[PDB]
Amino acid sequence: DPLKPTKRSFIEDLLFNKVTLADAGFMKQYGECLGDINARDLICAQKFNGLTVLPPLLTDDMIAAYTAALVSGTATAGWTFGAGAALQIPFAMQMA
Amino acid sequence: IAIPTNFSISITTEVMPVSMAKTSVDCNMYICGDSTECANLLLQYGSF
Amino acid sequence: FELLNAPATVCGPKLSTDLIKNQCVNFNFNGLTGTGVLTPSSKRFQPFQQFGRDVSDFTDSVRDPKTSEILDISPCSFGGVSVITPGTNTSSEVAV
Numbered sequence: 572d573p574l575k576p577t578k579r580s581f582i583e584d585l586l587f588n589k590v591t592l593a594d595a596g597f598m599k600q601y602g603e604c605l606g607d608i609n610a611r612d613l614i615c616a617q618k619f620n621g622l623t624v625l626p627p628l629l630t631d632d633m634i635a636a637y638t639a640a641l642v643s644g645t646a647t648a649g650w651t652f653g654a655g656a657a658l659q660i661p662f663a664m665q666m667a
Numbered sequence: 668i669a670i671p672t673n674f675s676i677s678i679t680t681e682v683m684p685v686s687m688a689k690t691s692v693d694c695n696m697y698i699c700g701d702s703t704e705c706a707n708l709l710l711q712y713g714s715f
Numbered sequence: 716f717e718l719l720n721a722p723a724t725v726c727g728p729k730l731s732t733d734l735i736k737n738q739c740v741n742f743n744f745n746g747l748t749g750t751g752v753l754t755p756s757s758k759r760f761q762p763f764q765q766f767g768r769d770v771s772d773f774t775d776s777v778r779d780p781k782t783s784e785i786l787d788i789s790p791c792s793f794g795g796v797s798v799i800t801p802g803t804n805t806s807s808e809v810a811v
């Protein structure tokens with residue numbers, strides 16, 4: 572949506588809502604863990620024991636950009652951009 | 668013979684895992700924590 | 716006798732020091748030795764309880780023998796580190 576701040580599509584927003592990803596982000600500062608000891612956070616416990624999770628190279632925004640490019644290509648060009656150079660075609664004729 | 672006369676446009680979802688969490692282990696941290704004696708014993712034990 | 720699981724009133728001839736907090740130290744509480752950072756705790760120990768353990772059986776809290784304050788114990792080491800190099804043959808300069 573050009574207006575909304577998400578930068579992803581509506582269905583993608585719903586899908587990202589459906590799945591519970593536990594902790595958001597891959598950064599957990601030492602001060603954060605020490606200041607919230609009372610809440611026995613699982614991530615703090617596993618980080619204090621040498622187990623770390625590394626962020627994916629492609630961010631969710633980058634993956635959404637790839638998906639948007641794929642959708643736009645199939646809408647404007649269709650199948651022709653998978654073989655050579657994307658060739659424009661009206662969507663109704665692609666449907667035909 | 669049976670011949671269809673009408674049709675529907677169906678949209679179905681296929682959910683496919685693509686990747687899992689990338690993880691790494693500080694072997695010394697997990698096995699020994701912050702103990703120096705345990706670290707030396709782990710060195711002597713062998714680096715798997 | 717029992718050693719490191721309950722309050723004690725018989726102790727070896729050792730000299731106590733001042734309580735240092737928010738600094739990585741080598742600590743010895745009633746004979747239990749270790750390395751960690753000590754912080755004030757919100758836990759409420761019963762009179763018959765001296766130590767507290769987390770799900771990993773790591774001693775994560777302790778009642779100060781002198782002030783009766785409850786202190787949380789945290790590991791000193793924490794945080795992922797990675798090294799970026801262009802190749803030792805090319806250069807000895809790295810990013811971290």
Ligand SMILES: *[C@@H]1O[C@H](CO[C@@H]2O[C@@H](C)[C@@H](O)[C@@H](O)[C@@H]2O)[C@@H](O[C@@H]2O[C@H](CO)[C@@H](O)[C@H](O)[C@H]2NC(C)=O)[C@H](O)[C@H]1NC(C)=O
Nearest residue numbers: 722723724730731732733734735778779780781782783784
């Ligand atoms: C244990 O004793 C300490 C120290 O108080 C006394 O005076 C010292 C100079 C020394 O002679 C000790 O052996 C004595 O017990 C008590 O510590 C209190 O708490 C604060 C915080 O660290 C300390 O600085 C103060 O000196 C003490 N406060 C007082 C005396 O009002 C501590 O409370 C005693 N604990 C028990 C369980 O009796």
